[PDB]
Amino acid sequence: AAKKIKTLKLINKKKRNDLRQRTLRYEEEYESERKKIIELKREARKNNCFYREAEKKVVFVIRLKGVNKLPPKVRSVFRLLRLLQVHNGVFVKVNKATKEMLKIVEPYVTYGYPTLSTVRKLLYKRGYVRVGKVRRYARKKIQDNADISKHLGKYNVHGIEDMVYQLYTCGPVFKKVNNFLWAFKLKPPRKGFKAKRHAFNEPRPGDWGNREAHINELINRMI
């Protein structure tokens, strides 16, 4: 018995060492990505030719509005989206069908590109996960990697930083991780809004729809 337990504990320690090594590669990659954007902009300024960077791949969508009086197509898209509660936030893979679905529920959601600090912070402070059997789930705060290393071990994620990495930039294993985590139930914004029922886009002060980068400040406001 003890030798098997010991071997497993050593394997568990090894895995944490492996996760540290993955985390280190991720850490290098984060700085490299930041520097590359800067370099791209500076090269563009020097040269006669102008340049732009790539698509940002994910979009974080926050719900804003109650569940009273919902249009039926909007109810369906909300159900698929998983923004069941009024302060639900969730990560979405940028696609055209996902964008079109997002457009249909738009007056009831704000959304944008979340940034690495926010992604890390949100998963750390407000990350809950679905623990149970398929459709017999339960809502648990994460607090240790071994639980989530179990379910996402088959798909080879095994660690919360790896989850942060995939959520921040959509990679080979996004759908499962995204689905597996419980939808983020956020607080109210700790300094409120200009006016809830008006668009961020409007000349009139408002808040719904695309908030792009600035979604992050709102997320920080309502954490």
Binding site: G66, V67, N68, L70, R75, F78, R79, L84, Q85, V86, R135, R136
Partner: protein, 186 residues
């Protein structure tokens, strides 16, 4: 407010536990529940559920039907979650190993005479707790006469359900809509 399909509830159906106050069957289901939860196999769990079921889901299994099945399984032990009945259309037996919920005495005697084996479920549990090399059997579900009246409305096209007829009488329930000559036909 959180929007919830079926108010977040799993509201699946069917028997919670045995409704009978019969001590032997309550004792028996406790045993098979214990075996079902501990044992890896499906077999025990399926037996436990089938033991719980209603009377109409406890049909009799025919001795001839069991015999017909077991001839491809020639040294193996049949278990039956129902009663085994005898057959007066049946000439003789070919020697069988049967576990059943209830035995008619004539069948049991016939099985003993044949040199076969009459197993209770407790005896089966003792001998074969795994269910390895055993064979799960069950009788006809839709044989029953109530079900012979179920399905599509009498006199409605392509229907073949038996009516809940008034009486046996010749003049009754063969006219309107049941023969082309009078009004119409189904």
């Amino acid at each position: 407010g959180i929007a919830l399909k079926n108010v977040g509830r799993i509201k699946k159906h069917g028997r919670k536990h045995l409704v009978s106050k019969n001590p032997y069957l309550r004792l028996l289901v406790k045993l098979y529940n214990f075996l079902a939860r501990r044992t890896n196999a499906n077999f025990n769990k399926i037996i436990a559920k089938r033991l719980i079921m209603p009377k109409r889901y406890r049909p009799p299994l025919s001795l001839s039907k069991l015999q017909y099945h077991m001839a491809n399984h020639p040294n193996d032990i049949a278990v039956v979650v129902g009663s085994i009945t005898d057959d007066k259309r049946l000439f003789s037996l070919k020697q069988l190993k049967v576990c059943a919920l209830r035995f008619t005495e004539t069948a049991r005697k016939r099985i003993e005479d044949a040199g076969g084996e009459c197993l209770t479920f407790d005896q089966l549990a003792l001998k074969y707790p795994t269910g390895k090399k055993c064979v799960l059997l069950r009788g006809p579900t839709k044989a029953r006469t109530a079900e012979k009246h179920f399905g599509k409305a009498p006199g409605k096209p392509k229907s073949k359900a038996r009516p809940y007829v008034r009486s046996k009488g010749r003049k009754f329930e063969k006219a309107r809509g049941r023969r082309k000559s009078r009004a119409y036909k189904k």
